[PDB]
Symmetry: C5
Subunit: 281 residues, 5 copies
């Protein structure tokens, strides 16, 4: 007789929360240089995926097509290309600050990591991701000339795409950018939760694919992606200024993300699963 | 190799649904409220993403050729992430309860007071989460504001048109559409219990929710978010035309689909199997 | 790690099909009717969703450029979830039974009277489910009502044109198309029987269902729903055309495909393998 | 306890070679009529999937769409819907000549099958696939009237798509058709290898889908699909001749496909993995 | 009764690094002929998938369509069709130079391979991929006429797409070509890591699919794809020159792909997982 074995590749409820807490408290045990290296690699991967998505969007930001689709196909394609960043980050074992704003905050709420340790991890991850992203921007994208102003509408679709995304990201106000970053980090935290839950390749790919595509097309502000995009837009001499790039956007973006991951998502999840995490431990 | 299966039969899926509904009636009130609020917030967030994508594909010059088609298709492609954002974190939505908890009430595993308390708390929490996300994120972000310029005002136009379409049905029409919506939603809930592999977990629910959204059926929580955002953004709808015209018939149709349309036939089909299962323990 | 196999050779698939057919000849008449009606309801729901999507992509300005290609493609994209709905709820349609139960008939595991019970009840219940959904949900939804304005009439126009296409074949053509449809459905049943993984379950049947849908092959239960809702919304078709001209040929072709096209050859192939498995 | 057991579904390399050789050797012991039936069933499945792909491509061959898109969308949809023939064949346990060219040839290289049996298997598979494909082309396509000349540019796009594909397939010279068939059978045997190394259902589906879609879009010639398409085109009275169908596309396509299955892939893999196979047999 | 076994098919980070080092070491023992055959087969597969991608892009390079969408549709379709190559390489057991620039370089850093062995394997893989790709560009692509210059513009879309792609690849400078190569191979090495960490068919297909499509659409330059494309362009008499192929694109491409495989990725991951591998081997 045939007796195939019934197997579950997914979990839920308290299991995912406990795994998230464990993943968070794991990171504070690394040394400063290991954390720096991981953050640098994550920032570089984000920059690579962002460059690829920008090339695709500029491809679909073409002069004549844009007059019909009005910048719709380009954003869809950019959001279709970006998600692979999650695979790059997770498979290499590197971490991104946006995910940490949930994982390490959860670990801290349970009182696994300490406040100074949390500060160390957050600061190192942020710095590493930032310098990784800007280094990739320069060395790969800026020197490749892929985003240079050609001064000819027929060929300048990539530069125009970058300029238009930068202007969109730069002409918000404080509160609107904060809100967009909140939504961004909600999506990112949900994606990390998904991978923490769906312990299979299919889920690992597609759940975070849909999450990242949704937050990319939606227009939510991601701190690392915004750092890369704003820096490279500055490099290729778009209309955005450095004061605009940093004060207007990246400060409210970091904040929104921080709130989304720590207060909006971490605190109620902790309130829900505190007793379960205790019972497991 | 060892032969395995991640898919169970209908009897086992019915048992799993009954148990999943039963367990709902043991959480304290505050945890149920928190989980319902989280589910409502997730639905509002994914609806915001879907609406922004649809508006992007609602470009005024693209309308003239494919009017309302690409925008709706993209909205239905983007929305289904909410099912994952709910399941992977243990949150619950009223719609899936309208099947699971009533099925657990049929088999005598819940009590009437318990059932009504659970349903009321779930609905109120979902409402709070959805409206809170709508206001804060969507309306402090200016994403759907009126720009008074046809070339740029496609997000507002898409939202206004969807809101009018929703609030211009009749009672019977809306009841039928909500019935269809909840049949799809509860069928996806059944899928996530019969399929225990990540690939199925994502894709079955994706297809179900996409068919829901494209078919124009009516979902109570998504409707709450959409009409509240259409009211603060000041489209051409009215508070009465929102609540009385859509959500009351929508809620009634959703509950009918959950409890009567599918709950009773499944109960009659599988009550003997459940009784035997119980005799086995 | 550990080496795991999620598939079966095909002899095991044949044994699984025979056992699946044998199982459903044991339920009560009422349980069978309930499952058949739920299956009909599911197919009606998915047909409604796919028809609405096709109507949306039937907009007249887009239609003047792309014909009906986009509408048909999107309808085929939306339809397939019906397989998931039926399989996950434990219900059956006539089309799948044409293979599953006819196999157990050949293998002597089901008797003629029980086979006729299963077949008749499945057909009647699927009919009841389809028409009831068509009335209660589709007709009262007003989605496919004739809004004479040409620009909003795409939903009605799509259904009208599809109904005309279905009812304007000849006997032989409709029988052939139904044969193709039921061959695809039986192959999807074999797919789910063979692939015990979520990815398999979803995609193997998704592609097959979309293929038969776009190909213009005729499904008896989907045809029932479409023709009944077309009559409800007052398209150009007649009841005589709906039933005599299309439905009877469609049923005949689907049964022939499920019973003689795939049943007899697979039996002649795997009869010894099943004999030994029974040992 | 949170300790799921680690599993792997892809076990490739030497193991895939063993699986291919044993799958080729299993075909040796089946009776003649069993192989004949399996071949006929596979040919019918190919005919069905090719009919579906042709109808979809014709649907996207609308003349107004054509004058702004050419055939690109039509071929894209054709290759998007065709790939289910592989699943139809493999799930039901039938055999196709193109996929046999690798496995049965490899089992003959290892001296597991004998030359007489190998010739029997190849001949029966080819003949049965021919019968199945032509039978589906007549009894399910010609009678369905789906590909019929309507004589209206608005409605005749299915017949026009089929006619254009047929004319394209019968204007190659010997060398070009042989080359395209070589590419096609490389893709087909490679899909067979992927299915032999993937045992999840997910890869089982999508690896095959991508391989067959690439082969279809690239224009590589598949012998079985070519018989189906050319026969249905002749039945409907397209701008084509039986000479152009058989002595200008089918023979070179068969030769190229067989060479790709047996020489381009095969002997290479034999050289790579025969010592590993010998060690396996020592076990 | 109802109690499925919890299973995971994914183990990233540390385990992926260990498996990468082991995979790198496994190459340093194959015989010269075996490695050459594997590299030739991999080059042949890359040529086949590049030919299919080019044909699809040429289909979607129709002059009327191109006049509206430019080259967006053709590039997307090429990126959709190409990723199948990874599947060919992994399932056949063959090897490609670009993934070796990480795997074998890692096995060298850990000292599981020697320097002579590493250089031999790397050069053999490169030469075999060269021979396979060129033999496919001749015996399959050129001899089929699929990319012939059929002057009439209505049908001359495959040739025009190939010509424009070649002109794009040929008209960079040293630094830009090197950077785009660095990007391509970071993507290829990440796809290899995806394959090594995910041990299920779904991930196998889809992670590498997305990585390869992202690299291809992004315009990043792959040495094996570059050789195939430029050789077939030379064969079909495009506007590029014999010198412009090798001294303008393939030399910088190879350089940058090697940098990506070895220093950009290899050094940080080594500095991350060195002591953990030390632990794992004791
Ligand atoms: C290792 O576990 C993880 C995995 C992913 C992230 C993450 O945050 C990734 C992004 O934010 C992103 F930008 F790459 C994308 F949105 F694309 F996913 C993380 O922090 C930790
Ligand atoms: C078993 O865990 C679940 C998962 C999902 C739901 C649910 O209700 C989902 C929807 O309602 C939805 F898909 F329509 C959307 F989320 F988009 F709103 C649920 O009730 C319970
Ligand atoms: C094993 O559980 C099942 C699942 C499906 C069927 C079936 O028959 C499917 C169709 O008929 C269909 F594909 F046409 C559609 F689903 F669209 F209705 C069945 O018989 C049994
Ligand atoms: C039983 O295991 C198999 C599986 C597949 C084939 C095969 O050959 C498949 C094709 O050739 C194909 F994909 F091109 C199409 F089906 F489309 F024709 C085979 O021979 C044997
Ligand atoms: C056997 O394990 C592998 C599998 C694949 C590669 C590889 O490198 C493949 C490519 O580079 C490529 F050409 F297919 C693409 F550029 F698309 F990625 C490898 O090195 C080792």
């Amino acid at each position: 007789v045939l007796d195939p074995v019934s197997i579950k590749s997914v979990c839920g409820g308290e299991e995912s929360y406990i795994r998230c807490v464990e993943y968070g408290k794991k990171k504070a045990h690394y040394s400063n240089l290991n954390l720096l290296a991981k953050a640098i690699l994550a920032g570089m991967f984000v920059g690579l995926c962002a460059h690829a998505s920008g090339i695709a969007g500029g491809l679909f930001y073409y002069h004549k097509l844009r007059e019909i689709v009005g910048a719709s196909m380009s954003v869809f394609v950019y959001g279709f290309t970006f998600p692979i960043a999650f695979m790059c980050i997770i498979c290499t074992g590197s971490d991104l600050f946006t995910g940490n704003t949930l994982a390490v905050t959860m670990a801290l709420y349970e009182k696994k990591v300490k406040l100074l340790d949390y500060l160390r991890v957050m600061t190192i991850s942020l710095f590493g991701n930032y310098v990784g992203a800007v280094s990739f921007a320069f060395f790969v994208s800026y020197l490749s000339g892929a985003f240079t102003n050609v001064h000819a509408v027929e060929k300048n679709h990539f530069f125009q795409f970058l300029n238009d995304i930068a202007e969109k990201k730069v002409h918000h106000t404080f509160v609107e950018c904060v809100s967009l970053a909140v939504g961004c980090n909600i999506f990112v935290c949900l994606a990390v939760y998904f991978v923490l839950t769906l312990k299979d390749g299919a889920g690992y790919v597609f759940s975070v694919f849909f999450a990242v595509y949704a937050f990319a097309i939606a227009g939510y502000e991601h701190i690392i992606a915004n750092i890369y995009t704003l820096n490279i837009a500055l490099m290729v001499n778009t209309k955005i200024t450095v004061y605009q790039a940093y004060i207007k956007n990246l400060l409210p973006t970091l904040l929104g993300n921080y709130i989304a991951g720590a207060i909006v998502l971490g605190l109620p999840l902790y309130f829900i699963y505190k007793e379960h995490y205790y019972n497991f431990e």
